[PDB]
Amino acid sequence: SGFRKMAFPSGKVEGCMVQVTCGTTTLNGLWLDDVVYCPRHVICTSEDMLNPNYEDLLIRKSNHNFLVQAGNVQLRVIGHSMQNCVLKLKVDTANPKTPKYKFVRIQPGQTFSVLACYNGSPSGVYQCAMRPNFTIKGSFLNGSCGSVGFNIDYDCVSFCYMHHMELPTGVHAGTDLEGNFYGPFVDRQTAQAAGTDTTITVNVLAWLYAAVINGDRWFLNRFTTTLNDFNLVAMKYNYEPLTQDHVDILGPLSAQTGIAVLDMCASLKELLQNGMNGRTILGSALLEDEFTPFDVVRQCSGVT
Amino acid sequence: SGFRKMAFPSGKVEGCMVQVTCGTTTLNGLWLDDVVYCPRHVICTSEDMLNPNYEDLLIRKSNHNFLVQAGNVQLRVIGHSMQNCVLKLKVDTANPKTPKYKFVRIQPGQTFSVLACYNGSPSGVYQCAMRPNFTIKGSFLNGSCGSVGFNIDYDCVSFCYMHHMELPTGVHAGTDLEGNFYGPFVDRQTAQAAGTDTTITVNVLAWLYAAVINGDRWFLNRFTTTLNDFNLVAMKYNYEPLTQDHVDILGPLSAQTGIAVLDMCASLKELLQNGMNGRTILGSALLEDEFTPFDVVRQCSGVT
Numbered sequence: 001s002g003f004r005k006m007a008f009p010s011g012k013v014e015g016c017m018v019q020v021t022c023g024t025t026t027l028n029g030l031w032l033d034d035v036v037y038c039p040r041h042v043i044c045t046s047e048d049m050l051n052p053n054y055e056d057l058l059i060r061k062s063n064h065n066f067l068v069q070a071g072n073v074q075l076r077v078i079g080h081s082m083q084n085c086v087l088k089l090k091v092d093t094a095n096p097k098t099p100k101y102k103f104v105r106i107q108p109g110q111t112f113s114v115l116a117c118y119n120g121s122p123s124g125v126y127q128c129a130m131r132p133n134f135t136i137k138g139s140f141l142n143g144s145c146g147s148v149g150f151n152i153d154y155d156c157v158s159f160c161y162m163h164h165m166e167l168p169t170g171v172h173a174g175t176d177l178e179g180n181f182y183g184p185f186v187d188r189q190t191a192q193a194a195g196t197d198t199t200i201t202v203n204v205l206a207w208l209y210a211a212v213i214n215g216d217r218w219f220l221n222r223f224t225t226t227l228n229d230f231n232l233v234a235m236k237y238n239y240e241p242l243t244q245d246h247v248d249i250l251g252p253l254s255a256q257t258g259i260a261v262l263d264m265c266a267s268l269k270e271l272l273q274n275g276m277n278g279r280t281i282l283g284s285a286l287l288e289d290e291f292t293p294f295d296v297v298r299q300c301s302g303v304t
Numbered sequence: 305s306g307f308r309k310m311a312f313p314s315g316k317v318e319g320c321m322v323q324v325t326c327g328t329t330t331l332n333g334l335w336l337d338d339v340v341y342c343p344r345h346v347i348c349t350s351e352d353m354l355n356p357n358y359e360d361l362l363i364r365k366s367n368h369n370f371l372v373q374a375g376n377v378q379l380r381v382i383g384h385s386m387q388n389c390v391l392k393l394k395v396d397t398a399n400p401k402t403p404k405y406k407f408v409r410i411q412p413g414q415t416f417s418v419l420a421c422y423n424g425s426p427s428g429v430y431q432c433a434m435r436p437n438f439t440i441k442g443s444f445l446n447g448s449c450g451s452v453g454f455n456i457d458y459d460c461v462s463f464c465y466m467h468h469m470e471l472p473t474g475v476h477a478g479t480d481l482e483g484n485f486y487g488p489f490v491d492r493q494t495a496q497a498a499g500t501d502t503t504i505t506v507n508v509l510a511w512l513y514a515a516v517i518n519g520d521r522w523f524l525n526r527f528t529t530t531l532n533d534f535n536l537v538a539m540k541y542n543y544e545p546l547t548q549d550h551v552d553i554l555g556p557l558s559a560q561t562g563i564a565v566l567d568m569c570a571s572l573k574e575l576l577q578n579g580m581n582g583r584t585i586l587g588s589a590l591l592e593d594e595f596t597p598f599d600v601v602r603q604c605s606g607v608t
């Protein structure tokens with residue numbers, strides 16, 4: 001029992017973190033097989049960052065300009081290429097700690113673990129969600145760029161995020177491991193406002209199922225609703241619209257608890273309309289939206 | 305920027321987790337050097353757990369009754385002893401993945417990382433605090449016993465917690481790695497009520513400093529208070545009394561922010577007396593007490 005914001009064990013990703021230095025800029029890279037993946041802004045001075053021409057900046061860079069250190073042993077760079085917003089540095093040695101891995105572009109609402117890193121060294125691990133405005137609410141200081149988000153399925157690490165940038169509003173923007181930004185963000189020091197940070201309704205509902213399973217039931221009411229009626233309420237409160245897809249995904253939590261998805265929607269409707277009246281749910285005084293239905297099943301069943 | 309409930313990288317502890325089986329009971333052990341540490345209730349049937357005589361149960365057990373598996377390779381047990389509430393199983397092989405490590409008994413209010421495990425396999429990692437009533441608010445299913453709490457100082461893992469028991473109130477009790485329970489808890493299936501779960505005042509104040517550093521300042525007021533005056537308010541709200549020791553520990557956050565500890569105490573006093581009036585601090589609608597002053601400094605400075 002008990003419900004915790006839980007990250008994946010970070011060991012498999014720890015073994016892939018390296019330091020990448022180009023001139024005076026140091027940040028983190030990800031070493032998988034004989035390739036080190038890092039943000040392309042490694043080649044920039046913070047002066048460059050106001051309006052960088054990455055193609056032009058990269059012409060000036062040779063393999064020997066990319067200093068790659070794994071612990072206290074230097075990797076030899078035999079090749080470099082820009083793919084979108086990442087650099088791929090070919091090294092002469094395959095990372096012996098390379099786990100089974102995939103590159104995946106996640107959808108907004110999807111959760112993952114961040115191994116925050118500085119100078120290629122892990123500092124800590126936390127669970128995130130891709131916000132519907134394609135930002136993440138992270139914890140990243142100068143030097144954290146190239147820190148990666150990931151999921152683990154048994155022994156396979158699915159990398160989904162590489163950290164690139166803090167918006168002037170202190171939220172975080174980054175790419176997949178093909179170097180494509182989530183959302184409309186560019187690797188430039190410029191006016192970039194995030195859109196509306198909507199609540200991930202299916203995640204809140206999953207979290208309400210998790211609460212019921214853990215004995216926090218005070219918020220269960222006598223009411224039901226319809227997808228259309230719920231969705232009017234959700235519009236009002238900047239909640240993501242709930243689809244039949246979301247209802248189907250919540251099926252196993254529905255079955256386990258014996259609470260129909262639409263009944264739980266009516267509980268959420270009352271919580272939105274009435275607030276928690278100074279009460280808590282799984283030790284939160286607001287509605288948590290960074291557990292997926294899959295996250296609730298996994299934590300509540302104990303998958304390793 | 306941004307502030308996250310952050311766990312230590314779990315890699316170093318992942319390499320120590322093994323499965324221990326005695327008859328029909330399986331749980332987790334911790335393999336350091338040539339010793340596997342596990343909860344002594346590994347020798348119990350859930351029938352035994354109502355009133356176990358561990359000394360008597362252990363007479364019936366030989367080294368070959370303790371099945372210890374690290375991945376898919378069996379460890380040979382050459383010795384067993386009971387120390388307090390843990391078993392120490394001497395194996396013929398030193399864990400090659402043994403990190404630098406210490407056993408430490410933490411004080412209530414101290415934070416640590418839990419690597420939740422099932423059948424010796426890591427499922428996830430989260431940050432905890434030892435509550436002032438010597439319970440932890442964990443996430444532990446059947447099979448999670450022997451999962452361990454730890455801190456890391458650069459390369460040294462300080463193990464502080466081994467998981468033993470869920471109270472009927474769904475909070476968690478356990479031992480240090482010498483097998484001494486935190487608080488008055490015993491490894492028996494019996495009436496055990498936790499005392500008052502007081503709020504860790506010095507941690508809440510550290511978290512308010514973290515909020516100020518991250519731009520969440522709405523709660524800073526024009527008032528100050530005294531230790532004695534604050535402590536009357538803290539008594540009323542089941543907050544731990546604030547000592548000069550706590551004030552000294554908060555010194556560096558005080559210096560960084562230029563907000564005197566007693567001024568911040570007056571901000572906390574108003575928040576206790578007035579509540580947050582539907583507002584949030586670092587994305588929380590209540591006062592977070594599971595960051596230590598050390599945690600705030602580390603996260604806010606980026607220690608690896």
Ligand SMILES: NC(=O)[C@H]1CCC[C@H]1c1ccsc1
Nearest residue numbers: 041049164165166187188189
């Ligand atoms: N907004 C930021 O993170 C800037 C401060 C440090 C990195 C730099 C940047 C800008 C666009 S990509 C990286």
Ligand SMILES: NC(=O)[C@H]1CCC[C@H]1c1ccsc1
Nearest residue numbers: 345353468469470491492493
């Ligand atoms: N309260 C509990 O956790 C019981 C259920 C499973 C383990 C068993 C126990 C009791 C005292 S120590 C371990």
